[PDB]
Amino acid sequence: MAAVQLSELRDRQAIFETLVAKGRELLACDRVIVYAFDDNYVGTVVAESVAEGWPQARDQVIEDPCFREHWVEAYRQGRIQATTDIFKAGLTECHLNQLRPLKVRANLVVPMVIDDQLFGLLIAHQASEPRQWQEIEIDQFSELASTGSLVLERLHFLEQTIASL
Ligand X SMILES: *[C@H](c1[nH]c(/C=C2\NC(=O)C(CC)=C2C)c(C)c1CCC(=O)O)c1[nH]c(C[C@H]2NC(=O)C(C)=C2[C@@H](*)C)c(C)c1CCC(=O)O
Q: Does residue 51 belong to the site contacting ligand X (CB under 6 A)?
A: no
Provide the 10 A C-beta neighbour count for residue 114: 17
Q: Which of 30, 34, 86 is nearest to 57 (CA)?
A: 34
The distance from CA 27 to its chain's CA centroid, rounded to whole angstroms, is: 15
Q: Does 85 bind ligand X (CB under 6 A)?
A: no
CA 130 to chain centre: 19
92 lies in the binding site for ligand X (CB under 6 A):
yes
Regarding 102 and contact with ligand X (CB under 6 A), the answer is: yes
Shortest gap between Cβ of 3 and ligand X (angstroms)? 44
- Is residue 90 at the binding interface for ligand X, with CB under 6 A as the rule? yes
Q: Which amino acid is at 3?
A: A
38 binds ligand X (CB under 6 A): no
For ligand X, the binding residue among 6, 9, 94, 150 (CB under 6 A) is: 94
Report d(CA 142, CA 136) in Å as an integer: 10
* E-strand stretches of 86-134: 108-114, 117-125
Of 34, 104, 113, 122, which lies in the binding site for ligand X, with binding defined by CB under 6 A? Answer: 104
Residues forming the site for ligand X (CB under 6 A): 62-67, 70, 81, 89-90, 92, 94-95, 98-99, 102, 104, 109, 125
